[PDB]
Design a protein around this ligand. Structure first.
Ligand code: NA
Length: 294
């Protein structure tokens, strides 16, 4: 597939709530910008081979979430609400008005939550392996079930994620169909070389709305899934087999229940669909974008 391992983007940094957040910023500076939101345990690196399909026709902005990627690492609890506050302010610091969202994992919770609060400002949502309510563990795929249950068990989770760096060395390769190369692994490892900096990677999977907990995250996600269900905004939904957060049966269900939703099968896929078929994801987004103007 010739999947590029390089990250050939000029680094940019903007002051947000007294901290520096890194972001990619390429492509033309008129038109509607496309805002790329990664999740755990990733960063803007996740979008490296999708962005070139879009940059020719649209501005691409891809921030690194606070405590992740090349962004500053303040001493926060790194709950979802921390991420909401920082992204809201990133968005304001960049003077963005209307945007198109391209989102994944916790980047999708952030995006969908920002959309619900600012519906008039989002012209489209491209999403994949995104956060929805997981009412039973039974719907979490077997192969990844014990991994995440352990992440969420008291003290054992921290030892795995902070001490063994398990999210990076274990969960991450598991969530990619193809074998990641060492070069790719080293980019992903980069922000988390020091154990103490791995805090956001532990808090996040403990924020996942699974089996009713944490209750506040469940309610928030349900609220944005309800907004999404009601919203006429154009939607582009990428899915793989068997997936992780989004099983093929869930995508098919959403294909019918979500208004103005086009679904796209990337082929074999787990968690980081971007790593398995970035050419289809990129080119489909690029084809879909011009229609957003009406
Ligand atoms: Na997570």
């Amino acid at each position: 597939s010739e999947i590029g391992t390089g990250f050939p983007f000029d680094p940019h940094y903007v002051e947000v709530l007294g901290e520096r957040m890194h972001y990619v910023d390429v492509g033309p500076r008129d038109g509607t910008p496309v805002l790329f939101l990664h999740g755990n345990p990733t960063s803007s690196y996740l979008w490296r081979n999708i962005i070139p399909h879009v940059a020719p026709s649209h501005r691409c902005i891809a921030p690194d979430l606070i405590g992740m990627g090349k962004s500053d690492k303040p001493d926060l609890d790194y709950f979802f609400d921390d991420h909401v506050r920082y992204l809201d302010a990133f968005i304001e610091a960049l003077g963005l008005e209307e945007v198109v969202l391209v989102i994944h994992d916790w980047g999708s919770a952030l995006g969908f939550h920002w959309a619900k609060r600012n519906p008039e400002r989002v012209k489209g949502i491209a999403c994949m392996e995104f956060i929805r309510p997981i009412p039973t563990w039974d719907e979490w795929p077997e192969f990844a079930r014990e991994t995440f249950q352990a992440f969420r068990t008291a003290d054992v989770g921290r030892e795995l994620i902070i001490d063994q760096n398990a999210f990076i060395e274990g969960a991450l390769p598991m969530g990619v169909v193809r074998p990641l190369t060492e070069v790719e692994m080293d980019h992903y490892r980069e922000p988390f070389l020091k154990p103490v900096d791995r805090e956001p990677l532990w808090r996040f999977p403990n924020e996942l709305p699974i089996a009713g907990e944490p209750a506040n995250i469940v309610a928030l996600v349900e609220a944005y899934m309800n907004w999404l269900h009601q919203s006429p905004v154009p939607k582009l939904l990428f899915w793989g087999t068997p997936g992780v957060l989004i099983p093929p049966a869930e995508a098919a269900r959403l294909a019918e229940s979500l208004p103005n939703c086009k679904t796209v099968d990337i082929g074999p896929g787990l968690f980081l669909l971007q790593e398995d078929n970035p050419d289809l994801i990129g080119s489909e987004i690029a084809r879909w974008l011009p229609g957003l103007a009406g």
